[PDB]
Design a protein around this motif. Structure first.
Motif, PDB file in Angstrom:
ATOM      1  N   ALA A 188       0.830  -1.200   0.000  1.00 56.47           N
ATOM      2  CA  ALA A 188       0.000   0.000   0.000  1.00 56.47           C
ATOM      3  C   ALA A 188       0.865   1.251   0.000  1.00 56.47           C
ATOM      4  N   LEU A 189       1.904   1.274   0.836  1.00 56.65           N
ATOM      5  CA  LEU A 189       2.788   2.432   0.887  1.00 56.65           C
ATOM      6  C   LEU A 189       3.508   2.625  -0.439  1.00 56.65           C
ATOM      7  N   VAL A 190       3.968   1.532  -1.049  1.00 56.76           N
ATOM      8  CA  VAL A 190       4.626   1.627  -2.350  1.00 56.76           C
ATOM      9  C   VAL A 190       3.686   2.235  -3.387  1.00 56.76           C
ATOM     10  N   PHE A 191       2.425   1.806  -3.387  1.00 62.78           N
ATOM     11  CA  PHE A 191       1.453   2.370  -4.314  1.00 62.78           C
ATOM     12  C   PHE A 191       1.255   3.860  -4.059  1.00 62.78           C
ATOM     13  N   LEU A 192       1.210   4.269  -2.789  1.00 59.31           N
ATOM     14  CA  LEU A 192       1.137   5.691  -2.473  1.00 59.31           C
ATOM     15  C   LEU A 192       2.365   6.433  -2.998  1.00 59.31           C
ATOM     16  N   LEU A 193       3.558   5.841  -2.850  1.00 60.22           N
ATOM     17  CA  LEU A 193       4.768   6.473  -3.368  1.00 60.22           C
ATOM     18  C   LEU A 193       4.670   6.679  -4.872  1.00 60.22           C
ATOM     19  N   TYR A 194       4.131   5.694  -5.583  1.00 57.31           N
ATOM     20  CA  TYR A 194       3.958   5.821  -7.024  1.00 57.31           C
ATOM     21  C   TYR A 194       3.093   7.028  -7.351  1.00 57.31           C
ATOM     22  N   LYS A 195       1.973   7.166  -6.653  1.00 58.81           N
ATOM     23  CA  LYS A 195       1.063   8.272  -6.925  1.00 58.81           C
ATOM     24  C   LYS A 195       1.671   9.608  -6.528  1.00 58.81           C
ATOM     25  N   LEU A 196       2.373   9.659  -5.400  1.00 58.08           N
ATOM     26  CA  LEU A 196       3.004  10.909  -4.998  1.00 58.08           C
ATOM     27  C   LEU A 196       4.033  11.344  -6.030  1.00 58.08           C
ATOM     28  N   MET A 197       4.832  10.396  -6.515  1.00 56.71           N
ATOM     29  CA  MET A 197       5.810  10.686  -7.556  1.00 56.71           C
ATOM     30  C   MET A 197       5.144  11.290  -8.783  1.00 56.71           C
ATOM     31  N   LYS A 198       4.015  10.721  -9.202  1.00 55.51           N
ATOM     32  CA  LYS A 198       3.307  11.262 -10.353  1.00 55.51           C
ATOM     33  C   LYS A 198       2.811  12.673 -10.070  1.00 55.51           C
ATOM     34  N   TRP A 199       2.245  12.899  -8.883  1.00 59.52           N
ATOM     35  CA  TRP A 199       1.699  14.213  -8.556  1.00 59.52           C
ATOM     36  C   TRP A 199       2.788  15.268  -8.412  1.00 59.52           C
ATOM     37  N   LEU A 200       4.015  14.861  -8.085  1.00 60.66           N
ATOM     38  CA  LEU A 200       5.120  15.798  -7.943  1.00 60.66           C
ATOM     39  C   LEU A 200       5.926  15.969  -9.225  1.00 60.66           C
ATOM     40  N   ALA A 201       5.788  15.055 -10.182  1.00 61.73           N
ATOM     41  CA  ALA A 201       6.577  15.098 -11.409  1.00 61.73           C
ATOM     42  C   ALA A 201       6.195  16.290 -12.283  1.00 61.73           C
TER      43      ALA A 201
ATOM     44  N   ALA B  34       1.816  18.728  -1.272  1.00 55.04           N
ATOM     45  CA  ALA B  34       1.995  17.312  -0.995  1.00 55.04           C
ATOM     46  C   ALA B  34       3.434  16.967  -0.647  1.00 55.04           C
ATOM     47  N   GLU B  35       4.356  17.921  -0.769  1.00 53.42           N
ATOM     48  CA  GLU B  35       5.770  17.630  -0.557  1.00 53.42           C
ATOM     49  C   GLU B  35       6.061  16.974   0.786  1.00 53.42           C
ATOM     50  N   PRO B  36       5.471  17.395   1.909  1.00 50.52           N
ATOM     51  CA  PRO B  36       5.780  16.730   3.190  1.00 50.52           C
ATOM     52  C   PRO B  36       5.428  15.257   3.224  1.00 50.52           C
ATOM     53  N   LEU B  37       4.563  14.792   2.324  1.00 49.45           N
ATOM     54  CA  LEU B  37       4.241  13.373   2.272  1.00 49.45           C
ATOM     55  C   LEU B  37       5.421  12.533   1.797  1.00 49.45           C
ATOM     56  N   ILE B  38       6.437  13.144   1.183  1.00 52.77           N
ATOM     57  CA  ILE B  38       7.670  12.413   0.905  1.00 52.77           C
ATOM     58  C   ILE B  38       8.240  11.864   2.205  1.00 52.77           C
ATOM     59  N   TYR B  39       8.361  12.731   3.210  1.00 54.68           N
ATOM     60  CA  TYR B  39       8.852  12.308   4.510  1.00 54.68           C
ATOM     61  C   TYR B  39       7.928  11.274   5.127  1.00 54.68           C
ATOM     62  N   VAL B  40       6.623  11.547   5.112  1.00 51.92           N
ATOM     63  CA  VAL B  40       5.666  10.660   5.766  1.00 51.92           C
ATOM     64  C   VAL B  40       5.736   9.264   5.165  1.00 51.92           C
ATOM     65  N   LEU B  41       5.731   9.171   3.835  1.00 50.24           N
ATOM     66  CA  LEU B  41       5.757   7.853   3.215  1.00 50.24           C
ATOM     67  C   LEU B  41       7.093   7.160   3.440  1.00 50.24           C
ATOM     68  N   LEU B  42       8.193   7.916   3.450  1.00 55.44           N
ATOM     69  CA  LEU B  42       9.487   7.328   3.774  1.00 55.44           C
ATOM     70  C   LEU B  42       9.453   6.672   5.149  1.00 55.44           C
TER      71      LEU B  42
END
Lengths: 29, 29
Positions: free
Chosen positions: A16-29, B3-11
């Motif tokens: 689940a966390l990995v999937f969230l990381l994927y989405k966050l990466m897309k939203w920040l790209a 959403a940038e702080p979620l980098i830390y949270v997800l890490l």
């Protein structure tokens, strides 16, 4: 009763966390 | 606000799960 089912639980919670990381990466790209 | 702080949270949440996996592995070994 054993800890064995936590293998599944930790697998799918980490996925689940990995999937969230994927989405966050897309939203920040 | 971003959403940038979620980098830390997800890490750190993923690290928590990894640490749990380490302990589960030890308890099952």
């Amino acid at each position: 009763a054993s800890a064995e089912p936590l293998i599944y639980v930790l697998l799918v919670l980490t996925l689940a966390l990995v999937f969230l990381l994927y989405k966050l990466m897309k939203w920040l790209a």
